[PDB]
Amino acid sequence: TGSINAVYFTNWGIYGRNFQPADLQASKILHVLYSFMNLRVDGTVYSGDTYADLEKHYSDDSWNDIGTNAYGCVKQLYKLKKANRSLKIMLSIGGWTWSTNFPAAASTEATRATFAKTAVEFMKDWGFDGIDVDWEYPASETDANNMVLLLQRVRQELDSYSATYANGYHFQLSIAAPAGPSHYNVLKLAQLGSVLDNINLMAYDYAGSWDSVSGHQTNLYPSTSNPSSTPFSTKAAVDAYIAAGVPASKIILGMPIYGRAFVGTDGPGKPYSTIGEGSWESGIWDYKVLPKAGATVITDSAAGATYSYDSSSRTMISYDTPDMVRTKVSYAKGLGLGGSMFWEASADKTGSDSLIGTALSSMGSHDSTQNCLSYPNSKFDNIKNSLS
Structure with a gap:
């Protein structure tokens, strides 16, 4: 039942932005996109900041817990999971800045297996509910087929992991997807639709310093009166994905x-x-x-x-203003999109002027898909004990 409300939460938001996991409106989010992990050319996924991810002690955290234990945003997000059962935590890998090793990571038998294995290792150790892959962006036809292969291997690893250790809990797998036709025309969109739980459309960053003229960065539609102001549109992307055979209900509309x-x-x-x-x-x-x-x-x-x-x-x-979010939600409802997505948490207003809040309010009820609170194979004592 309900709609997706997915939110990027950056592990570096904890510094200058002074935004910690506990400040999330956890009761209004179905997917936290925990960002980002890095990756090596050989497929090895690794933490880019172990202090933020696992070592930072909040005032609730002890220095002398029995065993080997997780702290940082990992423990903080798990706490939230326990109190809000619809809150899934996704391990986001790559992103705009860390996508240069993806082609090689996706390139072979060996590299794809390593990616899957290392990524699921983090998910099962840290107590997360799935993996979100943000390859920005596959360039060749080879890359595009390699992306399907990689997500399939990750899928295989999630399914096997769950069979042994999670009693068949359906861990999730998603991507951040391009709204620019030069990138999305390269993807095997139908096959992506088949293998993935969600495709989070990056319907933003349409205009910026790289344009000769000012423009709208996240407009729904081409402007026929003033076309130079709209180098892209969400409408064009959404139509292209649906026409390609991606189920509407898997397309989640990203907003800034x-x-x-x-x-x-x-x-x-x-x-x-x-x-x-x-x-x-x-x-x-x-x-x-x-x-x-x-x-x-x-x-x-x-x-x-x-x-x-x-x-x-x-x-x-x-x-995007709150009314603009309402207008986008209304458009998404008319196409049966799966819900909303946001980059990123820290910047939002509080109370009703929250964009995340305005989205959920417009969407109706929140994705009823429960999270997983069983991690018996965690290397972290407190996570395998579900912080009890």
Whole structure:
């Protein structure tokens, strides 16, 4: 019963952003996309930050627990799992920045087996409910077939692992998927639809510094009045995946919890001076700081987009407002998409102005799929004991 509400939670959010697992609205999330693990060319998946993942002690954590034990975000997320049975934790591997070893990792018998084995090792040790694979992006036809092979091998390993150790609990397997046709036209979309639980469409980052003119980063539709403002659209991607034979109910609509700025611009589809400053990097603003004083929120309903515009500084910021999320959820319902997805947790507003909250509110009820709280083969005593 219900809808997917999947949320990226970055292991580095714990530092400057000061955002810990316990601050998640765990009762409104069905999938935490715990990000990211790294990978070697030989397929070996590894932690990019063991302190954040497993070693950081929160004030609840003891230094002298009996045995070998997990702390960090791992223990914190497991705690949340116990209190919210619809909350699945996904081990996210790769991402935009760490995708350069994927081709080689997917390349052979051996490398794919190593990937599957190492990834499931983490899932079963850390007490997670599945694996989310974020290869950004397969380039060749060879890559595309190798991706199917890899996800199949991971699938095989999850199924075997569950048979021995989880009493047949159906661990999940998902991907982050391209909304750009140059990437998605390379994928074996139907085969991906068959093997995966969910395909999380990355329906964002459509415009940025790499464009000659300002644009909408996450619009539903092409703008016919102003086409230069819409180099992509979610509609085009969703249609292409459905037409390809991906079941609608496996497509989860990704949305940004952040803005992409264009400074010194007349508006959408115009020359801009610079992407300007950001919250944590140039040109990108946390949703929780938007809109800024002096900016008016604009809705373009034909293009299916919102943006803030400041006429004085000539600054446009492409982001999703709560009403925009409602509008997207409404579009997704009309196609029977499986639910919503967000990058990323830390930036969201609190209370009703939360995008994650607005999504669930619009979607109806939350995915009833229970998580797993049995990890007998965990190398971590506290996880195999389910923190009891």
